[PDB]
Symmetry: C3
Subunit: 152 residues, 3 copies
């Protein structure tokens, strides 16, 4: 009772100090290659890779390629693209059904920010998606190399 | 009694978090960070002009490196030495020439000026850079220097 | 009692939040320069340095140069070497007694993965160890510059 109470007050002090230390370290971690938005975190590897290799890096790391599902998420991702000045690959593709872009899960897009005229499947072989420094999207060949950005 | 059990369970979970966190703090700081007291300095690894550098730090939830003691200055110096690139500090005398202040407007509580500095060379040096030897020199804000933020 | 009960529930909520937030943060931290194996974490600095310099960097960081003690640890370390496509230095040397490799403490090796014919003290001057992209080890001159990888 009395012992338990003070034991609770003591443990909470420890937990709140931990919350403070963690919050500080989270900010430190995100600088300068990450961006937090909502409960999602985007982080770039700082280099470019073809889609398949980029996808594998994110999955092996316990996440997946950047999948902006709102204007806010797209804006956060855009910050990293602008910072590295390198267009990045998104996770979505229309490899299964041409013209129908989906997330790795197979779910259809719930948000899109296609540049005017896109997606055009240029050359009849653009099944991956890249995001430019202006935040707009363009379908591009999966074999091209683009900035690797994962979401966790 | 049920609460007693819950408390003992929480103690074990907290001990685990503390141990795991302790390890990750060391991992995080390697190789671009420095912890001194309750402050953490971290470099972006590249150079930028003052305004750009300042914005990067502020948007990241911190501010440009602002050593307030010899200890903090020495810690910051370690990053500068490691990257072999002089860095910008947060302080400027842009408001009133000759009076350097922190982004808040507060006057300096510590400084490590090289002899003869600040000298407002060319009548246009309102920013501050820190050398690999830890000394400070006022320099043009337009120059590009290592970006180091504090959190 | 009743109050203590409400506070314990609040504390429980705080700890659960931290467990979830910390787990996410760990994945973010490790991407793309770290590898977790068991209770050990390997992290590369992303650049090369001669042995002495690399060794000092790790020690000052509160850790030490990569010291794989099992096939599992060696495989984890190998992932970073492959990722950076740069051979890395291990912590072990035979500087004290030629022909006898030891950890920084002085203890004899508990595991090794030498390439065929190694260690061979080529030129009578190889007292350090490098790990290749294939995971095998080779003794090499300590003055050479190799990928810096520390363990924490
Ligand atoms: O290089 C491919 C690229 O070429 C142009 O920029 C446009 O036609 C794009 O739609 C297309 O993706
Ligand atoms: O250090 C002497 C002098 O050298 C250059 O002119 C600049 O770096 C000045 O800021 C400095 O004051
Ligand atoms: O042929 C093997 C031999 O090649 C070179 O001489 C060096 O890399 C040596 O360390 C290695 O033992
Ligand atoms: Ca980190
Ligand atoms: Ca197609
Ligand atoms: Ca297509
Ligand atoms: Ca296109
Ligand atoms: Ca002035
Ligand atoms: Ca001035
Ligand atoms: Ca000057
Ligand atoms: Ca020898
Ligand atoms: Ca030898
Ligand atoms: Ca050899």
């Amino acid at each position: 009772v009395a012992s338990l109470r003070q034991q609770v007050e003591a443990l909470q002090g420890q937990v709140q100090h931990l919350q403070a230390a963690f919050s500080q370290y989270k900010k430190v971690e995100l600088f300068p290659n990450g961006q937090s938005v909502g409960e999602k975190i985007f982080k770039t590897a700082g280099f470019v890779k073809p889609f398949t290799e980029a996808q594998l890096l994110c999955t092996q790391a316990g996440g997946q390629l950047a999948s902006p599902r709102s204007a806010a998420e797209n804006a956060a991702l855009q910050q990293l693209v602008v910072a590295k000045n390198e267009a990045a690959f998104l996770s979505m593709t229309d490899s299964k059904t041409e013209g129908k872009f989906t997330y790795p899960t197979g779910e259809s897009l719930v948000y899109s920010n296609w540049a005017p005229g896109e997606p055009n499947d240029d050359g009849g072989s653009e099944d991956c998606v890249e995001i430019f420094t202006n935040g707009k999207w363009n379908d591009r060949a999966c074999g091209e190399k683009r900035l690797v950005v994962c979401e966790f």
